[PDB]
Write a sequence for this structure.
């Protein structure tokens, strides 16, 4: 992108936190690894495309010699094309 | 069932102190921010606001990506947030025609 901000964006203000004890009760297409179709464990995230996979799953795909992102087929050179996502794991720890 | 206050730390932008709106992620360290927050910030820094890692040698915008998955989670988990943000946009545009 150019990362240009719209008129609305240029003046937007924060969405403040909900700080009451409101509890929460669908997240499959977000916290699920697309390889094993299980819930993400030790999430690894592609740098170029921000697609998330279990560490063991994506390392396995790459080790097989397929150097494509399983989600979007973008070139992945190696595991240095990937970052650990501890903050995604942490979210998953609390929700499940 | 989960307390939203238990989730908030994972859904909140440090640059505005509010929930992620158009969550945008620095690819070098994977820290995430609202789009508007991080774009404005990176006008005057090439280092992550949270961990100080270099975002890019010279052009930090090269190394951010919209994080649709994270934003989708945010809007699905935070009651009212999406409706609220959509309303703010309509309200803005009704008072500011094109
Ligand atoms: Zn997996
Ligand atoms: Zn991808
Ligand atoms: Zn923000
Ligand atoms: Zn960082």
């Amino acid at each position: 992108k150019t990362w240009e901000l719209s008129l609305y964006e240029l003046q937007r203000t924060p969405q403040e936190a909900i700080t009451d004890g409101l509890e929460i009760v669908s997240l499959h297409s977000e916290l699920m690894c697309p390889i094993c179709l299980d819930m993400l464990k030790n999430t690894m995230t592609t740098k170029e495309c921000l697609h998330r996979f279990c560490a063991d799953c994506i390392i396995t795909a790459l080790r097989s010699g397929n150097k494509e992102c399983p989600t979007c087929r973008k070139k992945l050179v190696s595991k240095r094309s990937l970052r650990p996502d501890p903050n995604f794991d942490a979210l998953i720890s609390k929700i499940y | 069932r989960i307390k939203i206050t238990e989730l908030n730390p994972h859904l909140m932008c440090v640059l505005c102190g509010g929930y992620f709106i158009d969550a945008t992620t620095i690819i070098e360290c994977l820290h995430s921010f609202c789009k508007t927050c991080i774009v404005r910030y990176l006008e005057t820094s090439k280092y992550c606001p949270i961990c100080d890692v270099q975002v890019h040698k010279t052009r930090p915008l090269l190394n951010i990506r919209s994080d649709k998955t994270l934003q989708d989670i945010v809007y699905k988990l935070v009651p009212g947030l999406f409706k609220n943000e959509m309303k703010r946009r309509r309200d803005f545009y009704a008072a500011h025609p094109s």
Summary: Residues A 46, 49, 51, 69, 71-72, 74 surround zinc ion (ligand 2) (CB under 6 Å). Chain B touches chain A through 49 residues (CB under 8 Å).
